[PDB]
Paper text:
Transient receptor potential (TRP) channels are polymodal molecular sensors involved in numerous physiological processes and implicated in a variety of human diseases. Here, we present structures of the full-length thirteen-lined ground squirrel TRPV1 solved by cryo-EM. Our structures resolve the extracellular cap domain formed by the S5-P-loops and the C-terminus that wraps around the three-stranded β-sheet connecting elements of the TRPV1 intracellular skirt. The cap domain forms a dome above the pore’s extracellular entrance, with four portals leading to the ion conductance pathway.
Numbering used by the authors:
A (entry chain A): 283 to 607, 618 to 779
B (entry chain B): 564 to 607, 618 to 704
C (entry chain B): 283 to 422
Write the structure that this text describes.
């Protein structure tokens, strides 16, 4: 059409993931492929792209069409002359155990619109992003991309970032204190190590800056709602803004360099919670930390700060100046509490557990001062904090499955971003496809498709299949093809 | 009582280990940023509010003073030997919100989930402990 | 075989505790015992050990095969000339109330590879350790 959608593309943009719509669309997607082979077999229908350059499998991943995605990646077609259109094969079947082969033609990152890359780099307006990696090829593909060539690269990145923060801690713990921020290099072994730790601190701050620029401009053209999608790359970029902003305040003869180095230091250890993904039970834990900040702590800290600024306004309005210029120093704060900042600080201490409840006496009407404090402790400490624990209790029950799937997407972005770092590793990133033969094409040529291998077992259906590739079972670097192939 | 202590085991291994990693990352993270702020005395002067006239310039003292926020004894004005009072309180408020408000109250919720899922399992682990 | 597994040992290491696999393995474990009594009754098939010294009941406890374990300890065989292969008997039945007897041949700690000792002293890599003590002899 004018969009460029063929018949198979239009079946994708029709399906809306419901149980009835998935049933016939994947049935109609089958019958048109089978008709597409019988009418003229020389044309591969799934290679046809629209004007957005998307194949019908890449279109199902670009939108949230999981039921079409689950069908294409697991497509078994039993009819001869149409066996080559299958994307799932079995290479042997010895009784109960049979070994399935999933084709990896456009997926597995070597192509341009690879659906593993299309899912993980989506813009969060597309539905079912966390669920599309749970289809049976894409889960085992990422897990075995994790178990070799990535988890040793990821544990190295977590080893350097711990060594980065230990250097940036020690270079900031032992910062000079004598005067203006351009400090002279004293010829000691300590100040040599101190300025070595500062050069390694800025060079990391340049690195997370340039890693954030290439996320914003070079790779991943981000929308305005995508800055509130990827929270991790903002947190590493905002850290590098405090680190590079420290260097600007360093050479500008300003002692405010320590006010920005400190914000880079507290946020830098807070960004150690990035690397706690890849560990499964710890990575699900930090996804739940995210969903407590966004869902339960944002709803708390609005109603809390409305109650905090509300009652502290009413306490300052009560309390006057000293007016008796006299009192024994109980803990000795003889203080003008007449600031709004001091009272908001003294009502925050009720939330911690350090609320004084007699923090001043410079008022009149002792009754309405305690009634304000008691209505504050009941509304905030008794009600609102204990309600936050209950609302965190509900959220854990409802995201208990979701946080496992958001983590597998967080690990998937790490797996794909690792492969983008090296063109040499991309030739290693062929995930076990081995260039296996899966039968014969029309014209009777060898098929030779990259196939991920999955071992399975069934104790009720014994798999006397029409198309089985190897007559001899297993894989021992010795192959033998089956004569049941028409070609 | 035996099912109760099997649940104590499954809170230490499953929920307290996941807590005390992210807690000690937040504790050592913000206490590093507080020590980096605070200097020596530099005024050698102040009325003894509870009388700790102290060099808080140790990393151990600040990690001890940020641990007290978790107990309920966090001072929140535990030193004055700094500059930039704004970024000192913003560090403490971001610590109390991340640890006391968020992370402790989340630990109670995650202990709430674990009790629901090990309610049958802890009875069977106990019968193995008795066996 | 080279491992030492007989036919009943191999039925144990095949079963993987699922609902369909438990159903026929314990059905096949029955039919081979019944054939094992009819062909030559002088040989007790469950006393045969492999090269790890495990009986077919001790092998089901050494691994996590709970469904084979739940079957052997509660095995009632109704056919005469095969009643002696049962491990669960009833000694009396007065109307509604009947008194069941569970055999304690290799279990109850007096033997060397007693399955009550084998389950409780497992190395935690074996599945279903906490659930294997919930079969009806081993709990009571
Ligand atoms: C002033 C001084 C204070 C300094 C320290 C405080 C410093 C400030 C507070 C940080 C507390 C965070 C805890 C550890 C951060 C490290 C985790 C991380 O680094 O980030 C993870 C999610 O951070 C989040 O909790 C951010 C919560 C919202 C904070 C506001 C953000 C504005 C900017 C992982 O999120 P991610 O970026 O990986 O994206 C996921 C996925 O990939 C996407 O596809 C989507 O599915 C989406 O759901 C994400 O789950
Ligand atoms: C790895 C295991 C991790 C576990 C723990 C990690 C190790 C822990 C510790 C490690 C080092 C600290 C212990 C030294 C004790 C005496 C120092 C001292 O105080 O003397 C002088 C400072 O001397 C300095 O400047 C300190 C050196 C700073 C180096 C910063 C980068 C380190 C890596 C470099 C490149 C890496 C390559 C080379 C790698 C070998 C005088 O001190 P002051 O400035 O006058 O006073 C400061 C005031 N204050 C102290 C009250 C705040
Ligand atoms: C010199 C100074 C630098 C120090 C170097 C230390 C950093 C560099 C070290 C990098 C290597 C760390 C790897 C350790 C684990 C071994 C790998 C493994 O397979 O085990 C597994 C268990 O692992 C866990 O579940 C534990 C969770 C650990 C999370 C925090 C890391 C602690 C590192 C130390 C403290 C950090 C330091 C904090 C700041 C200083 C991980 O895999 P899994 O997914 O969990 O399970 C598989 C899935 N399954 C359940 C289905 C089976
Ligand atoms: C000062 C201390 C602050 C501490 C915490 C601050 C931490 C950072 C705060 C950053 C700003 C808050 C926005 C969060 C991130 C934006 C992205 C987003 O979509 O929002 C959230 C939407 O989730 C919700 O809609 C439920 C919560 C309602 C928002 C609460 C706003 C109140 C003030 C808030 C400020 C409080 C303080 C200001 C008081 C005046 C993200 O949830 P989601 O899972 O991605 O999508 C769910 C889809 N759904 C909407 C259909 C369910
Ligand atoms: C300092 C105060 C510490 C207080 C608490 C320390 C108490 C002692 C801590 C001892 C060390 C921790 C290991 C516990 C015992 C080892 C045995 C084991 O298998 O682990 C646990 C695995 O359970 C999990 O996998 C979930 C939790 C992930 C581990 C958290 C590591 C973070 C740092 C941790 C250190 C924090 C402090 C360090 C901070 C840098 C046992 O669980 P399981 O039921 O037997 O098996 C579940 C199987 N599953 C994996 C498939 C689900
Ligand atoms: C106790 C002693 C302490 C003192 C000594 C320490 C001296 C020097 C210490 C630290 C040096 C400072 C490095 C600054 C660079 C940034 C740091 C960083 O974490 O970024 C990257 C580092 O990944 C890399 O590897 C980048 C290359 C770094 C140089 C290689 C160092 C190897 C030294 C090790 C040799 C030992 C083992 C050798 C093997 C036998 C990783 O981050 P990311 O995941 O890519 O992106 C962030 C996530 N994001 C995508 C959301 C944004
Ligand atoms: C999302 C954010 C990303 C933005 C990245 C930006 C990176 C750019 C880097 C630095 C930008 C700004 C930081 C330091 C610059 C001013 C320092 C300062 O003067 O402190 C002021 C407030 O300082 C603050 O509170 C600033 C808050 C920064 C953001 C905190 C959000 C939480 C307080 O100053 P003072 O108390 O009046 O000083 C008197 C003390 N004296 C006279 C004795 C000297
Ligand atoms: C976790 C958080 C708790 C931690 C505590 C942090 C809380 C921070 C709280 C306050 C910021 C701190 C700075 C001000 C206090 C110090 C100076 C002072 O005494 O006040 C001065 C300013 O006057 C005011 O403070 C404003 C007057 C009423 C407040 C109106 C705010 C409207 C709501 C806004 C929306 C908020 C609603 C939010 C709801 C979601 C008055 O004194 P002065 O006489 O003018 O000075 C003499 C010099 N002169 C005469 C030359 C000028
Ligand atoms: C959602 C929940 C919000 C509920 C809000 C909190 C509910 C809390 C639960 C229970 C209520 C207790 C609240 C505070 C107790 C007041 C007594 C007191 O403070 O002593 C003062 C007495 O001041 C007086 O004048 C006597 C009290 C009169 C008003 C009290 C209203 C209480 C009911 C409303 C409810 C101090 O004494 P004095 O200053 O020396 O004055 C004596 C002068 N005279 C001799 C003339 C009298
Ligand atoms: C529940 C827990 C809370 C309880 C609190 C317990 C917390 C314990 C915290 C600390 C241990 C206590 C001992 C040290 C403090 C006393 C001495 C001192 O002042 O510092 C000294 C050492 O210098 C340092 O302390 C190191 C400098 C930066 C820290 C780098 C650690 C890297 C991360 C590592 C991984 C951790 C990451 C973990 C994340 C999971 C500096 O003083 P000095 O000038 O050198 O001394 C003069 C003498 N001289 C000149 C002759 C040498
Ligand atoms: C995930 C959640 C993390 C959120 C973090 C915490 C959020 C908490 C909620 C709300 C924010 C309240 C935080 C602390 C209040 C700052 C005011 C203060 O401390 O008083 C200081 C004012 O110092 C100043 O310079 C004025 C404040 C400027 C920066 C404040 C940024 C607040 C927004 C960021 C958010 C003390 O006064 P002074 O020292 O005498 O300086 C006066 C000099 N002058 C006349 C030149 C100005
Ligand atoms: Cl005194
Ligand atoms: Na207290």
């Amino acid at each position: 059409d004018s969009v460029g959608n063929t018949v198979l593309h239009a079946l994708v943009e029709v399906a809306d993931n419901t149980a009835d719509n998935t049933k016939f669309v994947t049935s109609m997607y089958n019958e048109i492929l089978i008709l597409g082979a019988k009418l003229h077999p020389t044309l591969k229908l799934e290679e046809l792209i629209n004007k957005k350059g998307l194949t019908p499998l890449a279109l199902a991943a670009s939108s949230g069409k999981i039921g079409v995605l689950a069908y294409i990646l697991q497509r078994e077609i039993q009819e001869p002359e149409c066996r080559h259109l299958s994307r799932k094969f079995t290479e042997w079947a010895y009784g109960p155990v049979h070994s399935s082969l999933y084709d990896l033609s456009c997926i597995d990152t070597c192509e341009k619109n690879s659906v593993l890359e299309v899912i993980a780099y989506s813009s969060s307006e597309t539905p079912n992003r966390h669920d599309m990696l749970l289809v049976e090829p894409l889960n085992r593909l990422l897990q075995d991309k994790w178990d070799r060539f990535v988890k040793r690269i990821f544990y190295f990145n977590f080893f350097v970032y711990c060594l980065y923060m230990i250097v940036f801690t020690t270079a900031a713990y032992y910062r000079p204190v004598d005067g203006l921020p351009p400090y002279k290099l004293k010829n000691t072994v300590g100040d040599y190590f101190r300025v070595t730790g500062e050069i390694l601190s800025v060079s990391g701050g340049v690195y997370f800056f340039l890693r954030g620029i290439q996320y914003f401009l070079q790779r991943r053209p981000s929308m305005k709602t995508l800055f509130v999608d990827s929270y991790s790359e903002m947190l590493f970029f905002v850290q590098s803004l405090f680190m590079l902003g420290s260097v600007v305040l360093y050479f500008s003869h300003r002692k405010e360099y320590v006010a920005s180095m400190v914000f880079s230091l507290a946020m830098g250890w807070t960004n150690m919670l990035y690397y706690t993904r890849g560990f499964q039970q710890m990575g699900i834990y930090a996804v739940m930390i995210e969903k407590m900040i966004l869902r339960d702590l944002c709803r708390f800290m609005f109603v809390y700060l409305v109650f905090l600024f509300g009652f502290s306004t009413a306490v300052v309005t009560l309390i006057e100046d000293g007016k008796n210029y006299w009192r024994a120093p109980g803990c000795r704060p003889p203080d003008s509490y007449n600031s709004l900042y001091s009272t908001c600080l003294e009502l925050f201490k009720f939330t911690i557990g350090m609320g004084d409840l007699e923090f001043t006496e410079n008022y009149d009407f002792k009754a309405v001062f305690i009634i304000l404090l008691l209505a504050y402790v009941i509304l905030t400490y008794i009600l609102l904090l204990n309600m936050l624990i209950a609302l965190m209790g509900e959220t854990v029950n409802k995201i208990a499955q979701e946080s496992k799937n958001i983590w597998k997407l967080q690990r998937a972005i790490t797996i794909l971003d690792t492969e983008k770092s090296f063109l040499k590793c991309m030739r290693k990133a062929f995930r076990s496809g081995k260039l296996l033969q899966v039968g014969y094409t029309p014209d009777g040529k060898d098929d030779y498709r990259w196939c991920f291998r999955v071992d399975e077992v069934n104790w009720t259906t014994w798999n006397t299949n029409v198309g089985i590739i190897n007559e001899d079972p297993g894989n021992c670097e010795g192959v033998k093809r089956t004569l049941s192939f028409s070609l």
